[PDB]
Amino acid sequence: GLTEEQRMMIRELMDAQMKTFDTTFSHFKNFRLPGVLSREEAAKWSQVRKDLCSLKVSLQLRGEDGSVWNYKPPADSGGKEIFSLLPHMADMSTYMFKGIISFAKVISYFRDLPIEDQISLLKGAAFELCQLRFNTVFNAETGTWECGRLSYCLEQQLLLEPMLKFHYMLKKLQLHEEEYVLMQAISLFSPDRPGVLQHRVVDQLQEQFAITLKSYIECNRPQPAHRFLFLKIMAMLTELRSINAQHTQRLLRIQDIHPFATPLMQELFGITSLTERHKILHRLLQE
């Protein structure tokens, strides 16, 4: 069984997730939508075109009245059209990042850290926590992320893209809500994020969440069958960390030639003292 402490750790994470994860995206509003519309630089563009190809989705918006708007992105032609969904995706990402910041803030263990460590951990884990939450709304039979009234439908070859293969593989583990949130806590309290100062304290907090998850699995899942479920989860978190680094690099390349990041995204991703370089994040953690 779980110790009283492990049970309480899970309760706090579950309370934090229930208060800050808008699972139906009911409060995601006022977002932008695609509208009715040289040697070195050429290289930059070429790498970017590749960057965008992989994650191509159509967008579906279901109205209250029963109507449906569907958006099929353009094929890659000359150029600029390839960025048509960027403003929308920047709004969705920003909305998800705010929910991830709120999550962390409700956690005692996280609040007890020095503000600059709170900042450093959130910058290092934001994308990872967003992907873990998006996996819960991922429909693997249709290749769709079902976000309330919004849906993003992917447009063997897919498995080639590390982010898609991650969603398929994680979904197949059929995790419990508790296991997802513990995964979120482990990613969040990663002692090795750039700029972390209380490395030892974070490292120990991470080990506690990892032990709680290992014990949750031993106690709540049928024996032999789920013998290596904890290790498969840890492998998925290692892979997610690699996808996060690949993502940041892709984001920076795109931003370089076609700015689209929101102010909060700029802070999270390093786009243009640690509290002075992250005033928005600081204010969000301060309130």
CATH superfamily: Retinoid X Receptor
In the CATH scheme, the class would be: Mainly Alpha
Indicate the CATH architecture. Answer: Orthogonal Bundle
How would you name the oligomeric state of the polypeptide chains in this document?
monomer
Query: How big is the Rg?
Result: 20 Å
CATH topology name: Retinoid X Receptor
Describe this structure in words.
It is found in: Nucleus. Hyperforin binds at residues 93, 131-134, 247. Its main location: nucleus. One of its GO terms (biological process) is negative regulation of transcription by RNA polymerase II. Keywords: Activator, DNA-binding, Metal-binding, Nucleus, Receptor, Transcription, Transcription regulation, Zinc, Zinc-finger. There is one protein chain. This protein is α+β, with helices and mostly antiparallel strands and 287 residues long. It has a single domain, classed as Retinoid X Receptor, CATH 1.10.565. It contains eleven helices and five strands. The protein has helices at residues 4-20, 40-53, 86-106, 108-111, 115-136, 162-172, 177-188, 199-220, 229-257, 263-269, 279-286; strands spanning 57-62, 68-71, 138-139, 144-147, 150-154. A five-stranded antiparallel sheet has the order 2-1-5-4-3. The two termini are 37 Å apart.
What's the topology here?
Elements: H1 4-20, H2 40-53, E1 57-62, E2 68-71, H3 86-106, H4 108-111, H5 115-136, E3 138-139, E4 144-147, E5 150-154, H6 162-172, H7 177-188, H8 199-220, H9 229-257, H10 263-269, H11 279-286
Antiparallel strand pairs: 1-2, 1-5, 3-4, 4-5
Family: Belongs to the nuclear hormone receptor family. NR1 subfamily.
Binding site for hyperforin: 93, 131-134, 247
GO cellular component, one term: nuclear body
